[PDB]
Amino acid sequence: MAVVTMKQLLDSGAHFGHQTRRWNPKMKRFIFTDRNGIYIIDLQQTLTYIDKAYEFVKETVAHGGTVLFVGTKKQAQESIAEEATRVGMPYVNQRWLGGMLTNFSTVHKRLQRL
RNA sequence: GGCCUGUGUGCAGGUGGUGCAUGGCUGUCGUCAGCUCGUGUCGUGAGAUGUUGGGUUAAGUCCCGCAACGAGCGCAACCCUUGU
């Protein structure tokens, strides 16, 4: 089950993946072969985990949680802020701090101070 | 009974020792800019991190990027005198 289709997907560049001096997995199941020393995006895994992410993440999205829009890159500060102003959800701008998400009971106190 | 005369009984007192038994008080490094805690992450552990690195300061005073986020006791300042 696809989402929307190939040519009006293919418009703006589909072949990404980085530099060559850095790859480290082991995964022959996602590694293909050399031409001009660089790879192409993965067909079967795109489709299959598109479907699986769809079904289970809909189940949990019905189970009902929420996520901050923490957006940081200078490429997308205003873009993310615009969509976040549209969707109305809270957001953050600049930096991921070391050690909040575990030590939450004192950013609780930063909230009281806020 | 106030009171003081004695008798002795409880005694009362020490500038006699331990300041290395103690408290209190005080000088000193030093009015030098630092010294710690929370909760966390790291480390088997002693411990580290924060408090490293630049600009910057009378100074851990301040800014910027980061396993740190935060804070206190400090340095500043409301005190006195002088200066209009």
- Two tokens, residue A43: 């067909």
Beta carbon of A95 within 7 Å of strand B? Answer: yes
The one-letter code for the residue type at A114 is L
- SS3 label, residue A65: coil
What's the gap between Cα A103 and its chain centre? Answer: 25
Q: Which residues of A45-83 are buried (b: 16+ CB within 10 A; e: fewer)?
A: eeeeeeeeeeeeeeeeeeeeeeeeeebeeeeeeeebeee
In the complex, which nucleotide's C1' lies nearest to the CA atom of residue A109? B70
CB-based contacts of A42, cutoff 8 Å, min separation 6: A30
> DSSP character for A91?
E
> Which run of H or of E encompasses A69?
strand A69-70
- Two tokens, residue A109: 């106190």
Beta carbon of A92 within 7 Å of strand B? Answer: no
* A95 neighbors A74 (Cβ within 8 angstroms): no
Beta carbon of A35 within 7 Å of strand B? Answer: no
Q: Which residues of A85-114 are buried (b: 16+ CB within 10 A; e: fewer)?
A: eeeeeeeeeeeeeeeeeeeeeeeeeeeeee
Distance CA(A114)–CA(A112), nearest Å, equals 5
3-state helix, strand, coil split of chain A in percent (to 5) is 40, 5, 55
- SS3 label, residue A20: coil
CB-based contacts of A71, cutoff 8 Å, min separation 6: A77, A80, A81, A84, A91, A92, A93
